[PDB]
Design a protein around this ligand. Structure first.
Ligand code: CU
Ligand code: CU
Lengths: 129, 129
């Protein structure tokens, strides 16, 4: 038989092979692991979502619940001033919004609403002048 | 100032910018999001670890505790028949082991011991012939 196997991480963050067979006729067995480094949008996507600081947590929670189909943002969510699409690796998206939706001395947060990402992918947006 | 900003996911799964400035002299503001799709080994690495089925949970718990410098495998862990290094995107690693370490009528499992991967990155290794 063969005394080696090629196994890889896939774009779903699983092994491509759920089974390895080792023949008793093999003295030694060689496992070659590859990490292609490519993840599909459904497991590793990003967006950019803008809210008042106080509205972040509610918007993120309802955003996770809204699903990939809604770019992990609740449809017509009043707390969301602007958001991009959820994009995968090598992709781009742009969003334009009215600056009149911002007020001076208010705290604004941006985050990714892709489930679990708000913890790591956050920042502050400030109105200036 | 400008009425647009370029923001990107980075290899730590954070935004490259933690702060965005919008001048109130802008009528509209544009955010251009990029997803380069590249993650560093310290946040998205894989390995391949072989144990008896019954030893998986213990080996993975002690493995996560052992850290990246020990390839997320407890040094000299008796339950671990064989393991690769932890590798990052675009990388490869191999391990060879003696087939004499496997016995008939034992159940063998493999997994990735990179923290959080264990639930999705699993398979069965079967002695055959
Ligand atoms: Cu994200
Ligand atoms: Cu892994």
């Amino acid at each position: 038989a063969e005394c080696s196997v090629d196994i890889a991480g896939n774009d779903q963050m699983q092994f491509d092979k759920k089974e390895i067979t080792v023949s008793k006729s093999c003295k030694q067995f060689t496992v070659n692991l590859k990490h292609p480094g490519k993840l599909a949008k459904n497991v590793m996507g990003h967006n950019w979502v803008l809210t008042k600081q106080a509205d972040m947590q509610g918007a993120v929670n309802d955003g996770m619940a809204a699903g990939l189909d809604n770019n992990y943002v609740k449809k017509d969510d009043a707390r969301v001033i602007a958001h991009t699409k959820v994009i995968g690796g090598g992709e781009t998206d742009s969003v334009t919004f009215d600056v009149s939706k911002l007020a001076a001395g208010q705290d604004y947060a941006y985050f990714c609403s892709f489930p679990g990402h708000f913890a790591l992918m956050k920042g502050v947006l400030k109105l200036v002048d």
